[PDB]
Amino acid sequence: QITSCHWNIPTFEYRVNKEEGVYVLLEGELTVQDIDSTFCLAPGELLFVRRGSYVVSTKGKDSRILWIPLSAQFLQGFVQRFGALLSEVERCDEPVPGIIAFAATPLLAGCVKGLKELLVHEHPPMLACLKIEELLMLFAFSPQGPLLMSVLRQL
Amino acid sequence: QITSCHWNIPTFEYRVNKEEGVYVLLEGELTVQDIDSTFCLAPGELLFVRRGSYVVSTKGKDSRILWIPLSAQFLQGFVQRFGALLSEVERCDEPVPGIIAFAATPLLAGCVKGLKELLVHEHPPMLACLKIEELLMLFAFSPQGPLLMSVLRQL
């Protein structure tokens, strides 16, 4: 379900993500480009990406990255569980970018090191579901939360 | 709800916990004694304690510890959310100790550093609820999980 990704890409490739998701760069480099914009991120930064098509590249480096896909089912079972707190979030903007970048935060950093750790140590599967709810809940708490919220109504 | 605790106790005191809970020693020393047994724990070790009465001491040290109370309501709303996975856990033993100690594990360690971090950095309140579900889920996954499960039916 949630995948460590050893990628080497010197030029670029194309991705076509039928689901919303999260790209997080564990080791190496990773660029994500949509029609609008380009995002270059350090480890262990992440991006939230809408449904869509994307240009990805590693710059020919050896890169371990983490792809977390967010099913519609999960996203519902999430907003269901927490919809009351999420109604504290403001409404819109209405463009919603499609690639959403997040300011580096110690709590976000901790949530990332949680995912890393989950690859290396044996655990219950549901600990990952929880780690993602935590990440999502941090997004919704962020300044960029209303973006996510706007994406979250459409589906 | 969830409380940092600056305690200095040179001899001992008495606690009478109407709820199940978790004691985790952030800085200092902490002993927890029930009728059966005594537990001395390093930072950042923790204990799960049943409903009951306890002898606690700091050994006169300056001690920051964390008391996480687990309401019956929460414990239900927890077992509800995850009762299917918890039915993988074995049944009993039937004594259930009353103080449950857990082997030091990197994932448990990470869950503890998550709680620490939650004191210092601003966050949504529900991130703590999640951190506790994570800790609980690690207990149920542990060798000592059936103990917890046995406690969890009684209530």
PDB file of N, CA and C in Angstrom, chain A residues 60-147:
ATOM      1  N   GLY A  60      19.183  12.215 -11.982  1.00  0.00           N
ATOM      2  CA  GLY A  60      20.123  11.128 -12.155  1.00  0.00           C
ATOM      3  C   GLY A  60      20.720  10.599 -10.880  1.00  0.00           C
ATOM      4  N   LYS A  61      20.258  11.090  -9.734  1.00  0.00           N
ATOM      5  CA  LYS A  61      20.750  10.651  -8.441  1.00  0.00           C
ATOM      6  C   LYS A  61      20.056   9.359  -8.017  1.00  0.00           C
ATOM      7  N   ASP A  62      20.689   8.655  -7.091  1.00  0.00           N
ATOM      8  CA  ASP A  62      20.053   7.509  -6.458  1.00  0.00           C
ATOM      9  C   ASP A  62      19.127   8.061  -5.382  1.00  0.00           C
ATOM     10  N   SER A  63      17.838   7.734  -5.467  1.00  0.00           N
ATOM     11  CA  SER A  63      16.840   8.415  -4.652  1.00  0.00           C
ATOM     12  C   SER A  63      15.868   7.412  -4.062  1.00  0.00           C
ATOM     13  N   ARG A  64      15.770   7.418  -2.738  1.00  0.00           N
ATOM     14  CA  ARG A  64      14.749   6.678  -2.015  1.00  0.00           C
ATOM     15  C   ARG A  64      13.683   7.698  -1.634  1.00  0.00           C
ATOM     16  N   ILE A  65      12.461   7.497  -2.123  1.00  0.00           N
ATOM     17  CA  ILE A  65      11.353   8.400  -1.852  1.00  0.00           C
ATOM     18  C   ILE A  65      10.160   7.541  -1.448  1.00  0.00           C
ATOM     19  N   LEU A  66       9.159   8.188  -0.862  1.00  0.00           N
ATOM     20  CA  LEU A  66       8.012   7.490  -0.305  1.00  0.00           C
ATOM     21  C   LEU A  66       6.748   8.016  -0.960  1.00  0.00           C
ATOM     22  N   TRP A  67       5.978   7.115  -1.559  1.00  0.00           N
ATOM     23  CA  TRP A  67       4.728   7.475  -2.220  1.00  0.00           C
ATOM     24  C   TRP A  67       3.567   6.970  -1.395  1.00  0.00           C
ATOM     25  N   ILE A  68       2.777   7.904  -0.892  1.00  0.00           N
ATOM     26  CA  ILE A  68       1.659   7.553  -0.030  1.00  0.00           C
ATOM     27  C   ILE A  68       0.404   7.901  -0.816  1.00  0.00           C
ATOM     28  N   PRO A  69      -0.321   6.907  -1.323  1.00  0.00           N
ATOM     29  CA  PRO A  69      -1.559   7.207  -2.042  1.00  0.00           C
ATOM     30  C   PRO A  69      -2.724   7.287  -1.083  1.00  0.00           C
ATOM     31  N   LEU A  70      -3.594   8.250  -1.338  1.00  0.00           N
ATOM     32  CA  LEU A  70      -4.772   8.520  -0.517  1.00  0.00           C
ATOM     33  C   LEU A  70      -6.011   8.188  -1.334  1.00  0.00           C
ATOM     34  N   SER A  71      -6.539   6.989  -1.116  1.00  0.00           N
ATOM     35  CA  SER A  71      -7.773   6.565  -1.757  1.00  0.00           C
ATOM     36  C   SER A  71      -8.919   7.500  -1.414  1.00  0.00           C
ATOM     37  N   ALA A  72      -9.910   7.524  -2.297  1.00  0.00           N
ATOM     38  CA  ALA A  72     -11.157   8.205  -1.975  1.00  0.00           C
ATOM     39  C   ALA A  72     -11.809   7.591  -0.742  1.00  0.00           C
ATOM     40  N   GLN A  73     -11.810   6.253  -0.643  1.00  0.00           N
ATOM     41  CA  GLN A  73     -12.427   5.577   0.497  1.00  0.00           C
ATOM     42  C   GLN A  73     -11.810   6.064   1.799  1.00  0.00           C
ATOM     43  N   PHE A  74     -10.482   5.984   1.885  1.00  0.00           N
ATOM     44  CA  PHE A  74      -9.757   6.474   3.045  1.00  0.00           C
ATOM     45  C   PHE A  74     -10.102   7.924   3.322  1.00  0.00           C
ATOM     46  N   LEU A  75      -9.996   8.768   2.298  1.00  0.00           N
ATOM     47  CA  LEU A  75     -10.253  10.189   2.489  1.00  0.00           C
ATOM     48  C   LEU A  75     -11.638  10.434   3.080  1.00  0.00           C
ATOM     49  N   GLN A  76     -12.622   9.614   2.704  1.00  0.00           N
ATOM     50  CA  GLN A  76     -13.946   9.720   3.312  1.00  0.00           C
ATOM     51  C   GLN A  76     -13.908   9.238   4.757  1.00  0.00           C
ATOM     52  N   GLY A  77     -13.521   7.976   4.965  1.00  0.00           N
ATOM     53  CA  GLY A  77     -13.347   7.421   6.297  1.00  0.00           C
ATOM     54  C   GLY A  77     -12.487   8.279   7.207  1.00  0.00           C
ATOM     55  N   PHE A  78     -11.685   9.160   6.605  1.00  0.00           N
ATOM     56  CA  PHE A  78     -10.959  10.156   7.387  1.00  0.00           C
ATOM     57  C   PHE A  78     -11.860  11.328   7.743  1.00  0.00           C
ATOM     58  N   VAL A  79     -12.409  11.998   6.726  1.00  0.00           N
ATOM     59  CA  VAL A  79     -13.219  13.188   6.968  1.00  0.00           C
ATOM     60  C   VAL A  79     -14.426  12.840   7.827  1.00  0.00           C
ATOM     61  N   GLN A  80     -14.961  11.626   7.664  1.00  0.00           N
ATOM     62  CA  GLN A  80     -15.979  11.123   8.584  1.00  0.00           C
ATOM     63  C   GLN A  80     -15.478  11.172  10.018  1.00  0.00           C
ATOM     64  N   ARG A  81     -14.339  10.526  10.280  1.00  0.00           N
ATOM     65  CA  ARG A  81     -13.838  10.436  11.645  1.00  0.00           C
ATOM     66  C   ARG A  81     -13.618  11.810  12.264  1.00  0.00           C
ATOM     67  N   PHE A  82     -13.216  12.810  11.466  1.00  0.00           N
ATOM     68  CA  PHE A  82     -12.771  14.104  11.989  1.00  0.00           C
ATOM     69  C   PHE A  82     -13.531  15.302  11.423  1.00  0.00           C
ATOM     70  N   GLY A  83     -14.627  15.078  10.690  1.00  0.00           N
ATOM     71  CA  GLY A  83     -15.308  16.166   9.994  1.00  0.00           C
ATOM     72  C   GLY A  83     -15.698  17.352  10.864  1.00  0.00           C
ATOM     73  N   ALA A  84     -15.923  17.125  12.158  1.00  0.00           N
ATOM     74  CA  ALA A  84     -16.334  18.226  13.027  1.00  0.00           C
ATOM     75  C   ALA A  84     -15.195  19.218  13.227  1.00  0.00           C
ATOM     76  N   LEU A  85     -14.001  18.717  13.566  1.00  0.00           N
ATOM     77  CA  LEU A  85     -12.842  19.593  13.732  1.00  0.00           C
ATOM     78  C   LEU A  85     -12.475  20.268  12.420  1.00  0.00           C
ATOM     79  N   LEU A  86     -12.667  19.574  11.297  1.00  0.00           N
ATOM     80  CA  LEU A  86     -12.318  20.132  10.000  1.00  0.00           C
ATOM     81  C   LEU A  86     -13.239  21.266   9.596  1.00  0.00           C
ATOM     82  N   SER A  87     -14.428  21.344  10.186  1.00  0.00           N
ATOM     83  CA  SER A  87     -15.311  22.462   9.909  1.00  0.00           C
ATOM     84  C   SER A  87     -14.846  23.737  10.593  1.00  0.00           C
ATOM     85  N   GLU A  88     -13.796  23.659  11.411  1.00  0.00           N
ATOM     86  CA  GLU A  88     -13.110  24.856  11.875  1.00  0.00           C
ATOM     87  C   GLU A  88     -12.276  25.494  10.772  1.00  0.00           C
ATOM     88  N   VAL A  89     -11.861  24.713   9.774  1.00  0.00           N
ATOM     89  CA  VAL A  89     -11.043  25.242   8.693  1.00  0.00           C
ATOM     90  C   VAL A  89     -11.860  26.219   7.855  1.00  0.00           C
ATOM     91  N   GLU A  90     -11.173  27.226   7.321  1.00  0.00           N
ATOM     92  CA  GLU A  90     -11.812  28.210   6.465  1.00  0.00           C
ATOM     93  C   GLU A  90     -12.149  27.583   5.112  1.00  0.00           C
ATOM     94  N   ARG A  91     -12.880  28.335   4.299  1.00  0.00           N
ATOM     95  CA  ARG A  91     -13.376  27.834   3.026  1.00  0.00           C
ATOM     96  C   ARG A  91     -12.504  28.353   1.891  1.00  0.00           C
ATOM     97  N   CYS A  92     -12.033  27.438   1.040  1.00  0.00           N
ATOM     98  CA  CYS A  92     -11.317  27.799  -0.189  1.00  0.00           C
ATOM     99  C   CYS A  92      -9.976  28.479   0.180  1.00  0.00           C
ATOM    100  N   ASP A  93      -9.120  28.930  -0.746  1.00  0.00           N
ATOM    101  CA  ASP A  93      -9.415  29.353  -2.127  1.00  0.00           C
ATOM    102  C   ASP A  93      -9.951  28.251  -3.065  1.00  0.00           C
ATOM    103  N   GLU A  94     -10.534  28.682  -4.202  1.00  0.00           N
ATOM    104  CA  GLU A  94     -11.155  27.798  -5.188  1.00  0.00           C
ATOM    105  C   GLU A  94     -10.229  27.317  -6.316  1.00  0.00           C
ATOM    106  N   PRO A  95      -9.019  27.864  -6.505  1.00  0.00           N
ATOM    107  CA  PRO A  95      -8.146  27.268  -7.528  1.00  0.00           C
ATOM    108  C   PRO A  95      -7.689  25.880  -7.151  1.00  0.00           C
ATOM    109  N   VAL A  96      -7.475  25.653  -5.862  1.00  0.00           N
ATOM    110  CA  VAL A  96      -6.592  24.636  -5.295  1.00  0.00           C
ATOM    111  C   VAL A  96      -5.492  24.213  -6.270  1.00  0.00           C
ATOM    112  N   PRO A  97      -4.228  24.561  -5.958  1.00  0.00           N
ATOM    113  CA  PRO A  97      -3.081  24.336  -6.854  1.00  0.00           C
ATOM    114  C   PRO A  97      -2.914  22.972  -7.512  1.00  0.00           C
ATOM    115  N   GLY A  98      -3.108  21.885  -6.788  1.00  0.00           N
ATOM    116  CA  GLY A  98      -2.833  20.594  -7.390  1.00  0.00           C
ATOM    117  C   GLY A  98      -1.546  19.990  -6.879  1.00  0.00           C
ATOM    118  N   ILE A  99      -0.517  20.807  -6.665  1.00  0.00           N
ATOM    119  CA  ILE A  99       0.634  20.429  -5.844  1.00  0.00           C
ATOM    120  C   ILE A  99       0.685  21.391  -4.670  1.00  0.00           C
ATOM    121  N   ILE A 100       0.651  20.857  -3.453  1.00  0.00           N
ATOM    122  CA  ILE A 100       0.630  21.684  -2.254  1.00  0.00           C
ATOM    123  C   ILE A 100       1.903  21.435  -1.450  1.00  0.00           C
ATOM    124  N   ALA A 101       2.646  22.499  -1.217  1.00  0.00           N
ATOM    125  CA  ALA A 101       3.888  22.425  -0.468  1.00  0.00           C
ATOM    126  C   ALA A 101       3.658  22.932   0.950  1.00  0.00           C
ATOM    127  N   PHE A 102       4.430  22.396   1.886  1.00  0.00           N
ATOM    128  CA  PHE A 102       4.212  22.683   3.304  1.00  0.00           C
ATOM    129  C   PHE A 102       5.494  23.170   3.940  1.00  0.00           C
ATOM    130  N   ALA A 103       5.362  24.237   4.727  1.00  0.00           N
ATOM    131  CA  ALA A 103       6.498  24.770   5.466  1.00  0.00           C
ATOM    132  C   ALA A 103       7.070  23.690   6.387  1.00  0.00           C
ATOM    133  N   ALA A 104       8.398  23.661   6.488  1.00  0.00           N
ATOM    134  CA  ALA A 104       9.062  22.701   7.356  1.00  0.00           C
ATOM    135  C   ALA A 104       8.739  22.999   8.824  1.00  0.00           C
ATOM    136  N   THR A 105       8.253  21.989   9.534  1.00  0.00           N
ATOM    137  CA  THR A 105       7.820  22.161  10.904  1.00  0.00           C
ATOM    138  C   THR A 105       8.343  20.984  11.715  1.00  0.00           C
ATOM    139  N   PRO A 106       8.801  21.212  12.940  1.00  0.00           N
ATOM    140  CA  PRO A 106       9.243  20.062  13.746  1.00  0.00           C
ATOM    141  C   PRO A 106       8.177  18.971  13.852  1.00  0.00           C
ATOM    142  N   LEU A 107       6.905  19.326  13.978  1.00  0.00           N
ATOM    143  CA  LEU A 107       5.893  18.288  14.062  1.00  0.00           C
ATOM    144  C   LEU A 107       5.758  17.545  12.744  1.00  0.00           C
ATOM    145  N   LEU A 108       5.799  18.267  11.625  1.00  0.00           N
ATOM    146  CA  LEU A 108       5.840  17.591  10.341  1.00  0.00           C
ATOM    147  C   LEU A 108       7.090  16.740  10.239  1.00  0.00           C
ATOM    148  N   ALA A 109       8.221  17.280  10.698  1.00  0.00           N
ATOM    149  CA  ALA A 109       9.449  16.507  10.676  1.00  0.00           C
ATOM    150  C   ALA A 109       9.292  15.224  11.470  1.00  0.00           C
ATOM    151  N   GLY A 110       8.658  15.308  12.640  1.00  0.00           N
ATOM    152  CA  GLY A 110       8.468  14.125  13.442  1.00  0.00           C
ATOM    153  C   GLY A 110       7.575  13.124  12.753  1.00  0.00           C
ATOM    154  N   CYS A 111       6.520  13.609  12.096  1.00  0.00           N
ATOM    155  CA  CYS A 111       5.628  12.715  11.375  1.00  0.00           C
ATOM    156  C   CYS A 111       6.349  11.999  10.225  1.00  0.00           C
ATOM    157  N   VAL A 112       7.343  12.661   9.616  1.00  0.00           N
ATOM    158  CA  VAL A 112       8.133  12.046   8.552  1.00  0.00           C
ATOM    159  C   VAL A 112       9.047  10.974   9.128  1.00  0.00           C
ATOM    160  N   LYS A 113       9.764  11.293  10.217  1.00  0.00           N
ATOM    161  CA  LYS A 113      10.624  10.287  10.849  1.00  0.00           C
ATOM    162  C   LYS A 113       9.809   9.103  11.360  1.00  0.00           C
ATOM    163  N   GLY A 114       8.542   9.327  11.711  1.00  0.00           N
ATOM    164  CA  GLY A 114       7.661   8.218  12.029  1.00  0.00           C
ATOM    165  C   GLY A 114       7.471   7.266  10.866  1.00  0.00           C
ATOM    166  N   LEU A 115       7.305   7.804   9.656  1.00  0.00           N
ATOM    167  CA  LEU A 115       7.095   6.951   8.486  1.00  0.00           C
ATOM    168  C   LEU A 115       8.359   6.175   8.136  1.00  0.00           C
ATOM    169  N   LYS A 116       9.493   6.870   8.019  1.00  0.00           N
ATOM    170  CA  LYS A 116      10.789   6.209   7.901  1.00  0.00           C
ATOM    171  C   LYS A 116      10.897   5.020   8.856  1.00  0.00           C
ATOM    172  N   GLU A 117      10.758   5.291  10.163  1.00  0.00           N
ATOM    173  CA  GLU A 117      10.857   4.247  11.186  1.00  0.00           C
ATOM    174  C   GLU A 117       9.925   3.081  10.891  1.00  0.00           C
ATOM    175  N   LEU A 118       8.765   3.362  10.310  1.00  0.00           N
ATOM    176  CA  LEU A 118       7.794   2.323  10.044  1.00  0.00           C
ATOM    177  C   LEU A 118       8.262   1.371   8.952  1.00  0.00           C
ATOM    178  N   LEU A 119       9.124   1.841   8.041  1.00  0.00           N
ATOM    179  CA  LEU A 119       9.698   0.938   7.054  1.00  0.00           C
ATOM    180  C   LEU A 119      10.634  -0.061   7.721  1.00  0.00           C
ATOM    181  N   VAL A 120      11.503   0.417   8.610  1.00  0.00           N
ATOM    182  CA  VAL A 120      12.562  -0.415   9.191  1.00  0.00           C
ATOM    183  C   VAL A 120      12.119  -1.353  10.347  1.00  0.00           C
ATOM    184  N   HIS A 121      11.098  -1.015  11.128  1.00  0.00           N
ATOM    185  CA  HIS A 121      10.747  -1.793  12.314  1.00  0.00           C
ATOM    186  C   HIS A 121       9.405  -2.473  12.115  1.00  0.00           C
ATOM    187  N   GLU A 122       9.290  -3.707  12.592  1.00  0.00           N
ATOM    188  CA  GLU A 122       8.043  -4.449  12.483  1.00  0.00           C
ATOM    189  C   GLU A 122       6.956  -3.782  13.331  1.00  0.00           C
ATOM    190  N   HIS A 123       5.703  -3.831  12.871  1.00  0.00           N
ATOM    191  CA  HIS A 123       4.636  -3.025  13.458  1.00  0.00           C
ATOM    192  C   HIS A 123       3.289  -3.574  13.002  1.00  0.00           C
ATOM    193  N   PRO A 124       2.189  -3.139  13.619  1.00  0.00           N
ATOM    194  CA  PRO A 124       0.876  -3.446  13.067  1.00  0.00           C
ATOM    195  C   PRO A 124       0.614  -2.617  11.818  1.00  0.00           C
ATOM    196  N   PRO A 125      -0.142  -3.143  10.857  1.00  0.00           N
ATOM    197  CA  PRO A 125      -0.409  -2.352   9.648  1.00  0.00           C
ATOM    198  C   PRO A 125      -1.097  -1.031   9.952  1.00  0.00           C
ATOM    199  N   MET A 126      -1.981  -1.005  10.967  1.00  0.00           N
ATOM    200  CA  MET A 126      -2.818   0.159  11.252  1.00  0.00           C
ATOM    201  C   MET A 126      -2.020   1.317  11.836  1.00  0.00           C
ATOM    202  N   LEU A 127      -0.793   1.070  12.277  1.00  0.00           N
ATOM    203  CA  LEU A 127       0.056   2.162  12.723  1.00  0.00           C
ATOM    204  C   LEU A 127       0.349   3.118  11.583  1.00  0.00           C
ATOM    205  N   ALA A 128       0.360   2.607  10.357  1.00  0.00           N
ATOM    206  CA  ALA A 128       0.545   3.464   9.199  1.00  0.00           C
ATOM    207  C   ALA A 128      -0.694   4.302   8.929  1.00  0.00           C
ATOM    208  N   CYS A 129      -1.878   3.678   8.920  1.00  0.00           N
ATOM    209  CA  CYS A 129      -3.113   4.453   8.835  1.00  0.00           C
ATOM    210  C   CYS A 129      -3.101   5.611   9.821  1.00  0.00           C
ATOM    211  N   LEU A 130      -2.643   5.364  11.042  1.00  0.00           N
ATOM    212  CA  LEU A 130      -2.608   6.415  12.046  1.00  0.00           C
ATOM    213  C   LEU A 130      -1.599   7.497  11.682  1.00  0.00           C
ATOM    214  N   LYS A 131      -0.376   7.095  11.337  1.00  0.00           N
ATOM    215  CA  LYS A 131       0.626   8.051  10.882  1.00  0.00           C
ATOM    216  C   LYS A 131       0.102   8.967   9.781  1.00  0.00           C
ATOM    217  N   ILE A 132      -0.740   8.445   8.875  1.00  0.00           N
ATOM    218  CA  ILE A 132      -1.272   9.264   7.782  1.00  0.00           C
ATOM    219  C   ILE A 132      -2.343  10.225   8.291  1.00  0.00           C
ATOM    220  N   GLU A 133      -3.263   9.730   9.133  1.00  0.00           N
ATOM    221  CA  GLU A 133      -4.232  10.623   9.768  1.00  0.00           C
ATOM    222  C   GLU A 133      -3.509  11.781  10.458  1.00  0.00           C
ATOM    223  N   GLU A 134      -2.390  11.479  11.116  1.00  0.00           N
ATOM    224  CA  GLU A 134      -1.600  12.502  11.785  1.00  0.00           C
ATOM    225  C   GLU A 134      -1.079  13.529  10.792  1.00  0.00           C
ATOM    226  N   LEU A 135      -0.488  13.055   9.693  1.00  0.00           N
ATOM    227  CA  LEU A 135      -0.012  13.939   8.631  1.00  0.00           C
ATOM    228  C   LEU A 135      -1.143  14.787   8.044  1.00  0.00           C
ATOM    229  N   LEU A 136      -2.249  14.135   7.691  1.00  0.00           N
ATOM    230  CA  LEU A 136      -3.406  14.864   7.200  1.00  0.00           C
ATOM    231  C   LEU A 136      -3.849  15.922   8.188  1.00  0.00           C
ATOM    232  N   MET A 137      -4.048  15.522   9.445  1.00  0.00           N
ATOM    233  CA  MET A 137      -4.481  16.462  10.470  1.00  0.00           C
ATOM    234  C   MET A 137      -3.520  17.634  10.611  1.00  0.00           C
ATOM    235  N   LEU A 138      -2.226  17.401  10.438  1.00  0.00           N
ATOM    236  CA  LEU A 138      -1.292  18.520  10.392  1.00  0.00           C
ATOM    237  C   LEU A 138      -1.521  19.395   9.149  1.00  0.00           C
ATOM    238  N   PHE A 139      -1.823  18.795   7.992  1.00  0.00           N
ATOM    239  CA  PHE A 139      -2.137  19.616   6.825  1.00  0.00           C
ATOM    240  C   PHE A 139      -3.328  20.528   7.108  1.00  0.00           C
ATOM    241  N   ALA A 140      -4.393  19.956   7.672  1.00  0.00           N
ATOM    242  CA  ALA A 140      -5.620  20.713   7.871  1.00  0.00           C
ATOM    243  C   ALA A 140      -5.429  21.812   8.885  1.00  0.00           C
ATOM    244  N   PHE A 141      -4.530  21.589   9.830  1.00  0.00           N
ATOM    245  CA  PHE A 141      -4.143  22.588  10.808  1.00  0.00           C
ATOM    246  C   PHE A 141      -3.267  23.678  10.198  1.00  0.00           C
ATOM    247  N   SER A 142      -2.530  23.362   9.134  1.00  0.00           N
ATOM    248  CA  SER A 142      -1.597  24.294   8.517  1.00  0.00           C
ATOM    249  C   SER A 142      -2.319  25.520   7.952  1.00  0.00           C
ATOM    250  N   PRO A 143      -1.573  26.568   7.646  1.00  0.00           N
ATOM    251  CA  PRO A 143      -2.105  27.619   6.760  1.00  0.00           C
ATOM    252  C   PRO A 143      -2.686  27.096   5.455  1.00  0.00           C
ATOM    253  N   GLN A 144      -2.069  26.073   4.852  1.00  0.00           N
ATOM    254  CA  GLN A 144      -2.565  25.494   3.607  1.00  0.00           C
ATOM    255  C   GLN A 144      -3.730  24.540   3.820  1.00  0.00           C
ATOM    256  N   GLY A 145      -4.291  24.451   5.033  1.00  0.00           N
ATOM    257  CA  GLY A 145      -5.398  23.556   5.272  1.00  0.00           C
ATOM    258  C   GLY A 145      -6.638  23.783   4.430  1.00  0.00           C
ATOM    259  N   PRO A 146      -7.069  25.026   4.226  1.00  0.00           N
ATOM    260  CA  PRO A 146      -8.294  25.238   3.432  1.00  0.00           C
ATOM    261  C   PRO A 146      -8.171  24.760   1.999  1.00  0.00           C
ATOM    262  N   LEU A 147      -6.961  24.784   1.443  1.00  0.00           N
ATOM    263  CA  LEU A 147      -6.718  24.143   0.163  1.00  0.00           C
ATOM    264  C   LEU A 147      -7.112  22.680   0.227  1.00  0.00           C
TER     265      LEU A 147
END
